[PDB]
Design a binder for this molecule. Structure first.
Ligand SMILES: Nc1ncnc2c1ncn2[C@@H]1O[C@H](COP(=O)(O)OP(=O)(O)OP(=O)(O)O)[C@@H](O)[C@H]1O
Ligand SMILES: [Ca+2]
Ligand SMILES: [Ca+2]
Lengths: 125, 360
């Protein structure tokens, strides 16, 4: 169960916000400058790393499901969130975020507003 | 390239990891003389000269000698690949005995020489297929029915409910009440017909008493069906009485409680905090769940058991005959899952016991 995937190594190394998009059975890091703009036809994974006073880190994993995102993507997102949690010693809290029914917290991360945009990368099947 | 294989009681789902569906599906049956053996349709067609057997009883592998035949047929006959050239992912029933898990692994490496393998639980894959980590699944195939609650990725063995009631039982029941009506359905050939009827016309009744009252009064609920020889027959109140047995097991003379009831009991037997999410994510899997108005009749029955202010939501995707398989197809295709495999090297090192540590 030990994952050697580069993004897991970079996963939660310091406080901040980290985003990935599911792309044909693989996590790919979104450009820092495109954070907040989501393709409604794809599935994403979001990791919020918060600095605890005890010196340790807090983790909250949110997997976002676009309306038009394919089943391979929705399934991948969920499995990847289950994997990232284990990788970070089961410490993270798993959150399922659907398009339009996001939790206050998840909406709260984006300061300049969360935007949707139609389209998205193809399915892996 | 990876291969996925869902070993059901009645049917064997199998294909390539990356496909949106299994390339091969057939009956989990092995026939030998009363080459030297037949599997699947070959066996059924030549049922008169062969002694048929089921190598999986209630989702548990009983006959290992025959189970090997099932797999041989899966590799060479159906899918047509070299087992030793492809990593093979298998599936199991929830609460699978330690012994099975090992014996299962052994066979793949020793008697088949696969380069890598893995064994995940069916119900879990179904949940992953719905794009969910936490939730309670209701997998009901031909052999058995289960209630597998899952939280943040992993199942909860203590809250698992098993039920010896499934497709085959409903088929057999249909035969009884349809004969009592007037027709005659007893032989092995006549069962297959009754099974076709089950899958085509049967449906779950929102309010049972109101349908029995509406059946007795008009004939707007009746349907016709053409047999193979030609003769036509009408099917009345037994459209919805057959699948009703799932909610009221007493119908076939059982002691067990309803599927809606077992679901509740399961959820109740979990931690108080995670109760809300199990109620809010009821995924349905397996084949004997494909009745029309099933997600509706459940949705109604559970809301009546659970608190008034509780949010409920039943899920039954159109592809729930293959949910299990599809979940695995996605899992086997992941880039991260390249490390999760059990390689031959690791099997030689540790032997069959390695399965217990690598796979949950
Ligand atoms: N539309 C339908 N209505 C009712 N039953 C159906 C329908 N479609 C399929 N089935 C039933 O589903 C059963 C097979 O489903 P499935 O492949 O999930 O079972 P399995 O996994 O082999 O059994 P188990 O869950 O015991 O391992 C068959 O017995 C069939 O009668
Ligand atoms: Ca897409
Ligand atoms: Ca099954």
């Amino acid at each position: 169960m030990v994952v050697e995937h580069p993004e897991f190594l970079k996963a939660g190394k310091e406080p901040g916000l980290q985003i990935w998009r599911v792309e044909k059975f693989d996590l790919v890091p979104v450009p820092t400058n495109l954070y907040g703009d989501f393709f409604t036809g794809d599935a994403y994974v979001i990791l919020k790393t918060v600095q605890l006073r005890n010196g340790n880190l807090q983790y909250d994993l949110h997997y976002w499901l676009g309306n038009e995102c394919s089943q391979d993507e929705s399934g991948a997102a969920a499995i990847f969130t289950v994997q990232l949690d284990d990788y970070l010693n089961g410490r993270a809290v798993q959150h399922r975020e659907v398009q339009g029914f996001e939790s206050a917290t998840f909406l709260g991360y984006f300061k300049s507003g969360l935007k949707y945009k139609k389209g998205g990368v193809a399915s892996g099947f | 390239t990876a291969l996925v294989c869902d070993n059901g009681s009645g049917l064997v789902k199998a294909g390539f990891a990356g496909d949106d569906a299994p390339r091969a599906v057939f009956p989990s049956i092995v026939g030998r003389p009363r080459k030297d053996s037949y599997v699947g349709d070959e066996a059924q067609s030549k049922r008169g000269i062969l002694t048929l057997k089921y190598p999986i009883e209630h989702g548990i592998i009983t006959n290992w000698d025959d189970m090997e035949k099932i797999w041989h047929h899966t590799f060479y006959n159906e899918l047509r690949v070299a087992p030793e050239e492809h990593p093979t992912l298998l599936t199991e029933a929830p609460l699978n005995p330690k012994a099975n898990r090992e014996k299962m692994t052994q066979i793949m490496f020793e008697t088949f020489n696969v380069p890598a393998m893995y064994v995940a639980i069916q119900a879990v894959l179904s949940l992953y297929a719905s794009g969910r980590t936490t939730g309670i699944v209701l997998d009901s195939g031909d052999g058995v029915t289960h209630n597998v609650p899952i939280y943040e990725g992993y199942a909860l063995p203590h809250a698992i409910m098993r039920l010896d009631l499934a497709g085959r039982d409903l088929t057999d029941y249909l035969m009884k009440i349809l004969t009592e009506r007037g027709y005659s359905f007893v032989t092995t050939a006549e069962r297959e017909i009754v099974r076709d009827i089950k899958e085509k016309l049967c449906y779950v009744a929102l309010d049972f008493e109101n349908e029995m009252a509406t059946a007795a009064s008009s004939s707007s609920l009746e349907k016709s069906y053409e047999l193979p020889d030609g003769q036509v027959i009408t099917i009345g109140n037994e459209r919805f009485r057959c699948p009703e047995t799932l909610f009221q097991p007493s119908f076939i003379g059982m002691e067990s409680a309803g599927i809606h009831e077992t679901t509740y009991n399961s959820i109740m037997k979990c931690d108080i905090d995670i109760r809300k999410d199990l109620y809010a994510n009821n995924v349905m899997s397996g084949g004997t769940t494909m009745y029309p108005g099933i997600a509706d009749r459940m949705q109604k029955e559970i809301t009546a058991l659970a608190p008034s202010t509780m949010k409920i939501k039943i899920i039954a995707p159109p592809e729930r005959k293959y949910s299990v398989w599809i979940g695995g197809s996605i899992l086997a295709s992941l880039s991260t899952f390249q490390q999760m495999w059990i390689t031959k090297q690791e099997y030689d090192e540790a032997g069959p016991s390695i399965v217990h540590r690598k796979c949950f």
